[PDB]
Amino acid sequence: MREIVHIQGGQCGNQIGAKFWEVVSDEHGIDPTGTYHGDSDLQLERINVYFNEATGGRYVPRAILMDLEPGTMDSVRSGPYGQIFRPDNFVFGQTGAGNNWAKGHYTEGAELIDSVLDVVRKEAESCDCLQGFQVCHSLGGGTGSGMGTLLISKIREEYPDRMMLTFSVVPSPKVSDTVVEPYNATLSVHQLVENADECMVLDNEALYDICFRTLKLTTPTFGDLNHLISAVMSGITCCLRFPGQLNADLRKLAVNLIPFPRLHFFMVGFTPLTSRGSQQYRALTVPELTQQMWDAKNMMCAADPRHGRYLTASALFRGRMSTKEVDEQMLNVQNKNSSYFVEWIPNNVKSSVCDIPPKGLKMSATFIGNSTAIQEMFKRVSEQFTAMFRRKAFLHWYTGEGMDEMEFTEAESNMNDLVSEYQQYQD
């Protein structure tokens, strides 16, 4: 009875939120119409965390689909598992940010931030005991990053005790869908270091690398990439919706994985990813899952973990299993390579067992890692920012709306401070 209020932002967030509800409603037994047709009894024990009761046995999600262009939300409603959401939660804008962080945060997001707060206020007051607000967005965007982070700032001043999980898709190193991605990313992380309780860092070429060399997919689409990030989102909350041998809510991951209040940027990974040919041949054993989960290839962030030390890591295992093969395999990976783990924190790896595996799998696992190796990603984004900010290009849209050029300095200042504190734990 600890409810999560999901808020999706931007074209990416609404697309990744639609794919996220495809794996939750299916695993909980919700048909596309909205009713319950689950074949087991363990689902109905915990429906309230992501669904609300309705007349006729309908279950509607606690989802607030937030966007500034109507071209994204009409696609979500028309797709499969699409008309489950409420029509009131479908909050929309007219002008659209157009991949500008400035317009979303200040000018054309000011008349929408009041229209999205009362929807969240109505949803949060309806449920009895919040565990936290979960959001999913990008940082290179303008709608889901600019006005998305304004939503996070105005929800932390309202509820300062509840948690925050930001599944944020950072701009990619190798590819760039938008020219102003370094400008939008650095200003979005400037908000996220203080107000966000946790941050899930995802990168597209990290997803492309996993879909290529691990899944052997000839032509991945965005549906391939969305459902892998969707697997992580369902993997964190697997304890909340289902009983297990060792229970672990979101706040149990908060206390273990966060040493210091600015150490809340994590890198994720879904463990049992195989090609369709290799499904039958590979035996699904727990040390095989441990071998894949700690691999730098399987982890879903473009920052290479071998360049730094894991300050704290957590593994969330799902399925019927014994505790030891979870237990000493986490001990095995601490002793085989002790250089890759930090010294002053003993027993760096946290573990949890859930008794209900996801659909189609006997066993599964999900990884969370608080590595200092993610400083390279933030230093790279800061490298692109200082390249652009020195010549002051692409700024007249930002400073022409009412924000000053001084504000870009503090965005870079704590960006350099975020990697400054990451450096002084690697040494």
Next chain:
Amino acid sequence: MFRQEEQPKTGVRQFGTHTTGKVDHMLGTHATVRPEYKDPPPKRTVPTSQLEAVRNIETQYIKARKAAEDARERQGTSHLYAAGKGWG
């Protein structure tokens, strides 16, 4: 009992209930919107079946719309998790 007559229908020319001014969207339902008065679908995305039925043959416009719908469906397919079936 008395010589009782009919009053003449002297009045304004009255329009029926079908006019847009006197239409009652909630008629006899106690402040609930009546059926067959539906909310507008967003942007009126017509399916391609009606466009097929209007024309005699699947023309270039029909084939281009089919290609666009097929591309959208191929992008929406996850290729790792089937609809209603578990991974793989």
